[PDB]
Amino acid sequence: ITIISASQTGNARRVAEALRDDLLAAKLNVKLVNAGDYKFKQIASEKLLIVVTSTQGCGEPPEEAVALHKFLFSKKAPKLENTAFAVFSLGDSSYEFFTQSGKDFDSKLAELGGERLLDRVDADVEYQAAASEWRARVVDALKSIHTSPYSKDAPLVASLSVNQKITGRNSEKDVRHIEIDLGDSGLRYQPGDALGVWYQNDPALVKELVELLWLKGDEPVTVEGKTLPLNEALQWHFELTVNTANIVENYATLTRSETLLPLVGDKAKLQHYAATTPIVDMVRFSPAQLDAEALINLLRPLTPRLYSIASSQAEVENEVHVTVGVVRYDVEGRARAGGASSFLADRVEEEGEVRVFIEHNDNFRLPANPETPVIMIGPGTGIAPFRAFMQQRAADEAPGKNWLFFGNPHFTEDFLYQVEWQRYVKEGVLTRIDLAWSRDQKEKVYVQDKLREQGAELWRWINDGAHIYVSGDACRMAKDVEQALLEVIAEFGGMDTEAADEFLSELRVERRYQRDVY
Amino acid sequence: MSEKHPGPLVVEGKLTDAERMKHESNYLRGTIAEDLNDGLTGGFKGDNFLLIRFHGMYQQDDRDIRAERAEQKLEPRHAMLLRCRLPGGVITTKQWQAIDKFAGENTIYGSIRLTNRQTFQFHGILKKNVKPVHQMLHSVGLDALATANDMNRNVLCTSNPYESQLHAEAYEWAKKISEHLLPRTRAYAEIWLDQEKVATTDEEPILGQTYLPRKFKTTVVIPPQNDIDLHANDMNFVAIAENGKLVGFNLLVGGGLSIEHGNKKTYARTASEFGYLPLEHTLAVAEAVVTTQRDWGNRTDRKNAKTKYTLERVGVETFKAEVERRAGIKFEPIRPYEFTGRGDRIGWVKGIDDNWHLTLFIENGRILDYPARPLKTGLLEIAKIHKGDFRITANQNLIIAGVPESEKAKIEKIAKESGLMNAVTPQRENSMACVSFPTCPLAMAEAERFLPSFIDNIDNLMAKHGVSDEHIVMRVTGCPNGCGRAMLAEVGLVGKAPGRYNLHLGGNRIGTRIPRMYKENITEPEILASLDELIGRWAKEREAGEGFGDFTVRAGIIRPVLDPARDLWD
Ligand code: SRM
Ligand SMILES: Cc1cc2nc3c(=O)[nH]c(=O)nc-3n(C[C@H](O)[C@H](O)[C@H](O)COP(=O)(O)OP(=O)(O)OC[C@H]3O[C@@H](n4cnc5c(N)ncnc54)[C@H](O)[C@@H]3O)c2cc1C
Ligand SMILES: Cc1cc2nc3c(=O)[nH]c(=O)nc-3n(C[C@H](O)[C@H](O)[C@H](O)COP(=O)(O)O)c2cc1C
Ligand code: SF4
Ligand SMILES: [K+]
């Protein structure tokens, strides 16, 4: 019996840690191994295999489990004979893909003949009840942060030092450079980590939502074990900038609006509606005299947003830099915005109160050997961890070669940290930089095109043991860049597409192909 | 021997870095082709930053957003200024359509900036469009070679003589002079036009390996018009005609207006008369003068290299003797020439060829699509309809030349509807300014964006003083370089700091006298107060047909400059 934990942020990690605890207390044996240190090519020699997984940008497993997932899809997976399996999957209904990684894992493990002792079950953001009721049944049908006080639950109360836009005035996107002074708290981080920022909803948005429901704003509501006014709760503890299908169909059910009832039962229409309109506009389409308690039950708890750290403590000491791409969109001429990005962009004064913590990411790190070449693909707001990488390597005077791929719409407006990159290539820290400006000419050009153009040099670097890092969008960028890498590897390695995929999976296994995508 | 000019023929000293850059550039090639292919920076690195000027482009950034981009972790918005080589200012309607299309499409500002040297300028050209602009210029038969850095500048010709029959010969000679003094190098064609390299070295028999010490500027003057301001440029060929045909030229050497604030060694002096040369000796004389300046220039000091400084150092007599020896000719005595004015002839002007010339007043020479004032679109429609060619004027104005009687009504209808020739006071027509902000790297004060409001105030002032029908040549520069030629106007405002200028008075209507500095480092309200007092004085106690500069000199409020090399600053 072995428990497999496939988690990036770590919500499945704690579930697997609790699971192994009562398995070792009750049965005996039971060993726990993450997907990153699992000898997955010896899967056929397993007795009992429990998989606890997560779901990234769209259905893909966590980056450490991508190798195992591709193994199960490679037609080279062995035929299972003496192992029983049970799959527990986490996820979030807000996103388009709800625990599809667990569904795929369960389906394949069944297809290769694994004994499904427990059927796969789905977990929402509130996984406490599901995990607690799942581990008991797992046990029944089976018996034949390093040291800092700060964490997600108790974030460090830091201060905002610098909030500077790093895009030109003629840029369609608003990208901020946020410098947060950690003070004397001694918070420690590494390049590749993420800064979980607790935010607060816009007071204007909260007021508009409250008056849109014909409420006052000071009526008491029940939050946790205390009583707080409605505005306080909607600003500090509830999410308003994200619309989910569940929120929409609950509004329809507790409202019976003629314009919302027909959409109930159609997952595609509900998801499109949720992704197209915010909560406040969705309730603007149909005010329904909803009381404070109904609003509180309808919404979801506010959660911190992770941002890749754009600085290294070897250079900035007690500061953390994050590159915040502000989400700004207009619905019927009313300018709406994202929660945390707009909170950091507008709603925090200089030296203001920002509650942050560190989300450690071990599977996105610079090579331990300073001489190892590094290839980075960071178009858009994915340039932050590579700025941290460059600062860390320049501080250590690492002699290794560095290759950066950056992409954005406009060169004169969307070149993030351009002067820093010019300085880095001036001093030889950044050996090569390749830029792809998609909106500078008639034809769209992205980073993957530059990877295709530089196939021979990329292949030589990979043969030199280089590390490939991808950070940025996951819906389109990550898949396109992975395809470009596969094409380059297949073309310049003298081998077909399947062998290219196997080579990329091997690179993932040797911690040489690492992604931080969102 | 006069003690005024005791200096040697060639000054000895450490050569400037620019001369080294010219010497080691391998005949204007550099690494411009290689520098074009990098995307890390939007400009040209190394010596290419100055070598690209030899090909006609200036690397520039917007100074309105320079600090904002500096604090935005962004490099300055490096964009190129493409100045074309148009001898005499004559541009065909097909070429105008091409440049209009390029400015509308592949240029940040979307504007055609006419200059005072009878050519246009493209601002905000990205490095990726640096090659396509030269490609299209070659496609429509133009080029931008040797219009910046240290070669011959754009050659000027009077764009609208009263007897518009010598313009053909004068423009032909201006084009011949411009082509003669072009560099004989293949760098321009190899880099932009993509011509196969020849396995041999260049010669440059006209300019040499190191080229001229400074920029050289030439003009062709047809009296009595002086719109080209021949005293602001080195060589001037004052055309002389007998029986209605060109018979010779008058050579005036030693022009220049650039000064330095507080540097007595820099001055603005008027060109000195050399002599009359027969018509057939124009090219030889131009060659002799250019080569004499090349040999005797001050390559150790870049604020001492222009032909005026060489003239004042070696003496006019020795320079003339060397020019005569080099050209193998003798300078005949100067036949008399007179100047009536300096401005443009706005409106419809009848030509000898039964064609009408339409001079459009364009404010600051900026062609754009302003609200309810679509100058660019109207000009494009005119070019589509017109069958002649456009003549850019030295006053940053455009002349629609050779319009027949039948098409006169149509051209007037399209121009009037587009706001190209709407009502404008006479004072505004003789008011000019340099580009300055936000593009000029050396700009200290506002000239182009300050001229309209300033002239509005001045027009109101003249209306108050009842002299609104009269005009004063008023030129504002945001730089001591005098690019707007403020050092030849009746009232000149040379920039000193943002919002502060130096007021210069005592100029001339015909532009043959430098205006002496009156008050320095005074903001706009002080300038308007002083000019109000002086216009009120002028509007009463003036004579019949007296200009403002002549009145200021005569009234004793300012003293004229006689020899600018001695008493301009004193
Ligand atoms: C456009 C124009 C003024 C205008 O509004 O019309 C102009 C514009 C500039 N001039 Fe000029 N000069 C212009 C006529 C002049 C003239 C007047 C004339 O030729 O009739 C002079 C004063 C007379 C003289 O110098 O003899 C002039 C003397 C200069 C100088 C000073 C040269 C010197 O002797 O020290 C500089 C500075 C330099 O050369 O480095 C300069 C530099 C410049 C630059 C290229 C600034 C720079 O060095 O980067 C300007 C580009 C502005 C921009 O952002 O686009 N410009 N400049 C004229 C274009 C001429 C052309 O197209 O060929
Ligand atoms: C490991 C990791 C690293 C990250 N690193 C970074 C980083 O370096 N930089 C960075 O900027 N972000 C980064 N993120 C993303 C970050 O956590 C947030 O997702 C992002 O900043 C937006 O936060 P928000 O709360 O303001 O947006 P939200 O308010 O949560 O999202 C806005 C909502 O509006 C919707 N919406 C968007 N546009 C429209 C439109 N036009 N019409 C209608 N609806 C629309 C969206 O779908 C979404 O539902 C990272 C995420 C992770 C997990
Ligand atoms: C960028 C991003 C994309 C996500 N996409 C999905 C998704 O498509 N479907 C889903 O069910 N959950 C999605 N989630 C939610 C995660 O599955 C959820 O956070 C999970 O519990 C991860 O926790 P763990 O890292 O501790 O295992 C997404 C989360 C993030 C940050
Ligand atoms: S005079 Fe000075 S500010 Fe004006 S165009 Fe010339 S260099 Fe620029
Ligand atoms: K003008």
Side-chain angles (χ1 to χ4, degrees), chain B residues 53 58 60 81 83 113-117 119-121 123 147 153-154 156 214-215 217 228-229 232-234 255-258 302 306 308 396 432-436 439-442 481-485:
Chain B
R53 312 193 186 153
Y58 269 87
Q60 286 174 342
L81 154 73
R83 165 177 321 152
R113 175 62 161 87
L114 306 181
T115 75
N116 36 24
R117 281 198 78 75
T119 187
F120 67 93
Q121 268 178 185
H123 286 107
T147 198
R153 275 306 182 282
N154 197 96
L156 274 78
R214 251 284 196 191
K215 59 185 61 185
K217 307 181 183 266
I228 54 180
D229 243 337
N233 32 62
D234 311 69
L257 298 190
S258 54
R302 260 193 111 68
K306 271 216 79 70
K308 36 158 173 180
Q396 321 172 108
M432 102 169 291
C434 61
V435 182
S436 182
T439 34
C440 188
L442 323 179
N481 304 324
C483 282
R485 300 207 288 260

Side-chain angles (χ1 to χ4, degrees), chain B residues 198-484:
Chain B
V198 179
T200 198
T201 206
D202 308 273
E203 38 185 14
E204 304 271 11
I206 193 58
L207 311 173
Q209 168 133 29
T210 86
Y211 296 96
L212 288 126
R214 251 284 196 191
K215 59 185 61 185
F216 211 86
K217 307 181 183 266
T218 314
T219 49
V220 172
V221 194
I222 309 133
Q225 287 217 328
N226 195 9
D227 39 345
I228 54 180
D229 243 337
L230 69 103
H231 295 267
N233 32 62
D234 311 69
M235 269 179 336
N236 326 311
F237 286 105
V238 181
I240 289 195
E242 320 173 358
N243 214 314
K245 106 174 64 193
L246 225 66
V247 86
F249 281 105
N250 268 204
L251 182 66
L252 279 87
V253 176
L257 298 190
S258 54
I259 69 156
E260 187 191 359
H261 278 319
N263 192 343
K264 258 85 163 303
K265 310 272 136 290
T266 56
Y267 46 86
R269 70 180 292 274
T270 58
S272 268
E273 281 170 345
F274 268 17
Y276 173 84
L277 61 104
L279 175 275
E280 77 254 14
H281 285 172
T282 302
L283 280 188
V285 163
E287 188 200 300
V289 178
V290 169
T291 29
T292 316
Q293 157 66 14
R294 188 223 35 213
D295 282 3
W296 292 3
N298 192 332
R299 281 139 193 287
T300 95
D301 205 353
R302 260 193 111 68
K303 295 176 204 36
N304 216 341
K306 271 216 79 70
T307 320
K308 36 158 173 180
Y309 304 118
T310 303
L311 256 210
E312 290 297 298
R313 154 153 53 69
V314 318
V316 152
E317 184 39 59
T318 82
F319 203 110
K320 190 144 97 64
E322 185 80 4
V323 165
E324 286 174 327
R325 166 206 103 66
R326 198 156 314 207
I329 81 148
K330 286 275 116 177
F331 271 126
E332 270 77 78
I334 275 184
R335 332 194 157 192
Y337 67 103
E338 97 283 17
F339 282 125
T340 285
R342 209 152 34 125
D344 270 24
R345 342 164 60 195
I346 318 283
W348 283 108
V349 205
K350 197 150 136 73
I352 287 98
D353 293 347
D354 215 323
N355 308 348
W356 294 81
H357 299 8
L358 175 68
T359 315
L360 315 164
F361 165 76
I362 318 195
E363 195 174 73
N364 283 330
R366 190 65 65 152
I367 289 139
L368 259 153
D369 269 338
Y370 296 114
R373 259 197 318 146
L375 331 174
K376 200 172 183 278
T377 309
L379 276 178
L380 189 40
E381 258 63 71
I382 285 174
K384 302 253 206 57
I385 279 43
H386 189 34
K387 36 175 40 58
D389 44 25
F390 291 175
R391 309 195 185 141
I392 303 127
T393 322
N395 302 279
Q396 321 172 108
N397 292 351
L398 197 56
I399 308 182
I400 300 172
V403 172
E405 258 87 355
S406 155
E407 289 226 336
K408 219 195 82 152
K410 307 138 50 61
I411 288 289
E412 217 205 338
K413 169 119 172 303
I414 168 64
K416 260 278 181 233
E417 250 155 32
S418 98
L420 273 167
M421 69 191 227
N422 49 16
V424 137
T425 39
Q427 161 63 56
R428 190 174 243 111
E429 304 175 352
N430 331 92
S431 300
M432 102 169 291
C434 61
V435 182
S436 182
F437 290 90
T439 34
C440 188
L442 323 179
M444 281 144 108
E446 289 271 10
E448 202 210 1
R449 326 198 278 192
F450 165 79
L451 202 286
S453 94
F454 183 60
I455 291 314
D456 258 331
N457 295 336
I458 290 265
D459 275 316
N460 158 76
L461 201 43
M462 307 204 100
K464 153 203 309 184
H465 287 297
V467 74
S468 202
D469 84 336
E470 262 273 355
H471 63 113
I472 305 171
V473 201
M474 227 183 267
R475 306 186 174 156
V476 180
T477 68
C479 204
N481 304 324
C483 282

Side-chain angles (χ1 to χ4, degrees), chain B residues 27-319:
Chain B
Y27 290 95
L28 306 195
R29 296 204 171 58
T31 89
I32 302 167
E34 281 87 50
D35 217 312
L36 266 178
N37 282 335
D38 84 329
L40 201 257
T41 176
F44 292 89
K45 309 291 279 185
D47 279 346
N48 317 326
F49 176 84
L50 300 96
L51 282 177
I52 58 156
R53 312 193 186 153
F54 294 84
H55 305 284
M57 328 154 271
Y58 269 87
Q59 207 205 270
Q60 286 174 342
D61 62 19
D62 220 285
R63 290 184 81 191
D64 281 1
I65 62 182
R66 182 182 281 179
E68 167 210 290
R69 294 188 48 120
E71 55 190 43
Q72 270 171 7
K73 270 126 210 161
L74 267 167
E75 85 158 357
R77 183 166 85 164
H78 288 310
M80 254 46 69
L81 154 73
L82 190 271
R83 165 177 321 152
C84 174
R85 191 188 68 87
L86 274 165
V90 181
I91 173 161
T92 321
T93 32
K94 152 196 301 316
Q95 287 151 45
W96 186 266
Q97 288 172 217
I99 71 170
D100 196 311
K101 159 165 272 152
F102 189 85
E105 279 155 19
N106 317 81
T107 268
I108 293 178
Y109 300 85
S111 72
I112 297 130
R113 175 62 161 87
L114 306 181
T115 75
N116 36 24
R117 281 198 78 75
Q118 287 168 355
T119 187
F120 67 93
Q121 268 178 185
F122 284 144
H123 286 107
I125 294 197
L126 285 322
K127 196 167 73 174
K128 89 204 177 260
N129 297 311
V130 150
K131 189 143 179 158
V133 56
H134 290 280
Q135 297 272 62
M136 78 103 182
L137 281 176
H138 181 234
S139 94
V140 292
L142 296 170
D143 58 343
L145 159 86
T147 198
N149 245 308
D150 319 69
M151 282 133 309
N152 196 256
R153 275 306 182 282
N154 197 96
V155 173
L156 274 78
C157 177
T158 290
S159 280
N160 218 339
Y162 301 106
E163 42 169 310
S164 179
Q165 45 150 234
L166 315 88
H167 181 16
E169 304 102 50
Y171 163 64
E172 178 212 38
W173 268 117
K175 185 166 54 197
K176 285 162 116 305
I177 280 155
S178 189
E179 281 168 8
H180 190 205
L181 307 173
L182 274 183
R184 277 41 173 121
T185 185
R186 317 200 204 76
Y188 182 84
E190 277 172 28
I191 297 188
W192 322 112
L193 290 42
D194 257 359
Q195 150 204 321
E196 193 101 56
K197 319 231 181 223
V198 179
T200 198
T201 206
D202 308 273
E203 38 185 14
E204 304 271 11
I206 193 58
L207 311 173
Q209 168 133 29
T210 86
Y211 296 96
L212 288 126
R214 251 284 196 191
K215 59 185 61 185
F216 211 86
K217 307 181 183 266
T218 314
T219 49
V220 172
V221 194
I222 309 133
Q225 287 217 328
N226 195 9
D227 39 345
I228 54 180
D229 243 337
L230 69 103
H231 295 267
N233 32 62
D234 311 69
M235 269 179 336
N236 326 311
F237 286 105
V238 181
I240 289 195
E242 320 173 358
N243 214 314
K245 106 174 64 193
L246 225 66
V247 86
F249 281 105
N250 268 204
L251 182 66
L252 279 87
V253 176
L257 298 190
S258 54
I259 69 156
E260 187 191 359
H261 278 319
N263 192 343
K264 258 85 163 303
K265 310 272 136 290
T266 56
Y267 46 86
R269 70 180 292 274
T270 58
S272 268
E273 281 170 345
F274 268 17
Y276 173 84
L277 61 104
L279 175 275
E280 77 254 14
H281 285 172
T282 302
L283 280 188
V285 163
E287 188 200 300
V289 178
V290 169
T291 29
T292 316
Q293 157 66 14
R294 188 223 35 213
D295 282 3
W296 292 3
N298 192 332
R299 281 139 193 287
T300 95
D301 205 353
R302 260 193 111 68
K303 295 176 204 36
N304 216 341
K306 271 216 79 70
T307 320
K308 36 158 173 180
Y309 304 118
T310 303
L311 256 210
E312 290 297 298
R313 154 153 53 69
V314 318
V316 152
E317 184 39 59
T318 82
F319 203 110

Side-chain angles (χ1 to χ4, degrees), chain A residues 151-433:
Chain A
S151 200
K152 168 157 166 335
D153 318 280
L156 162 68
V157 185
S159 71
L160 170 77
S161 283
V162 154
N163 169 21
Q164 171 86 24
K165 196 175 182 283
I166 52 172
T167 36
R169 53 165 48 163
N170 295 312
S171 209
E172 303 222 271
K173 30 194 52 153
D174 193 348
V175 180
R176 300 302 183 98
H177 176 70
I178 296 277
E179 297 186 9
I180 286 155
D181 162 40
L182 302 172
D184 80 302
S185 64
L187 195 66
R188 200 129 289 270
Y189 61 87
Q190 272 193 258
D193 285 344
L195 183 77
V197 178
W198 282 92
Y199 73 101
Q200 294 143 37
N201 283 303
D202 201 350
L205 172 81
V206 167
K207 186 217 48 195
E208 167 179 8
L209 174 60
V210 158
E211 320 304 18
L212 223 55
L213 275 70
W214 288 308
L215 297 164
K216 297 129 297 283
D218 39 316
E219 45 279 58
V221 300
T222 279
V223 182
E224 330 282 2
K226 47 183 46 93
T227 279
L228 250 176
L230 191 39
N231 287 22
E232 270 323 285
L234 297 190
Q235 186 167 329
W236 257 269
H237 307 280
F238 290 97
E239 185 159 76
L240 296 188
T241 52
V242 176
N243 211 350
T244 89
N246 329 123
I247 293 192
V248 166
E249 50 66 40
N250 272 250
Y251 194 39
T253 279
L254 298 56
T255 278
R256 294 182 184 174
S257 166
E258 289 175 20
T259 91
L260 283 327
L261 279 177
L263 263 79
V264 168
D266 197 335
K267 294 103 163 93
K269 290 204 86 125
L270 278 199
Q271 284 163 347
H272 182 70
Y273 196 19
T276 42
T277 197
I279 281 195
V280 76
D281 285 303
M282 194 231 59
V283 83
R284 154 156 298 102
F285 289 158
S286 156
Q289 306 273 342
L290 264 201
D291 47 51
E293 296 174 351
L295 201 37
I296 287 329
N297 177 42
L298 202 90
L299 306 163
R300 296 168 46 161
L302 185 140
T303 47
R305 265 75 170 146
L306 309 179
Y307 297 87
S308 297
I309 290 171
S311 67
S312 165
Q313 277 208 301
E315 160 137 335
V316 302
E317 314 284 4
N318 62 331
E319 284 205 317
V320 46
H321 302 184
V322 284
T323 295
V324 176
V326 189
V327 172
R328 295 199 195 282
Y329 59 97
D330 286 60
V331 180
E332 322 146 7
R334 273 169 329 246
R336 269 89 178 84
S341 60
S342 71
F343 172 70
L344 292 173
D346 308 327
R347 294 196 292 273
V348 185
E349 318 254 3
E350 301 284 71
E351 308 301 322
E353 198 126 0
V354 183
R355 304 194 287 138
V356 302
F357 56 93
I358 302 298
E359 198 83 357
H360 308 283
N361 193 28
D362 288 346
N363 50 278
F364 196 84
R365 294 280 193 254
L366 283 157
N369 200 349
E371 282 130 313
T372 301
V374 158
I375 303 164
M376 309 153 311
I377 310 146
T381 54
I383 204 46
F386 304 139
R387 181 180 191 264
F389 282 10
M390 270 316 101
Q391 290 196 357
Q392 181 65 50
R393 278 211 145 181
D396 275 359
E397 312 290 348
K401 304 179 297 191
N402 304 305
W403 203 343
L404 175 68
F405 289 88
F406 182 69
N408 245 352
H410 289 289
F411 166 77
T412 54
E413 311 302 301
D414 293 299
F415 199 168
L416 311 182
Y417 306 115
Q418 171 169 21
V419 306
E420 321 227 6
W421 301 128
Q422 300 187 329
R423 182 178 61 80
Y424 279 137
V425 305
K426 199 182 73 204
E427 324 163 338
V429 172
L430 185 61
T431 310
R432 294 179 183 171
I433 175 161

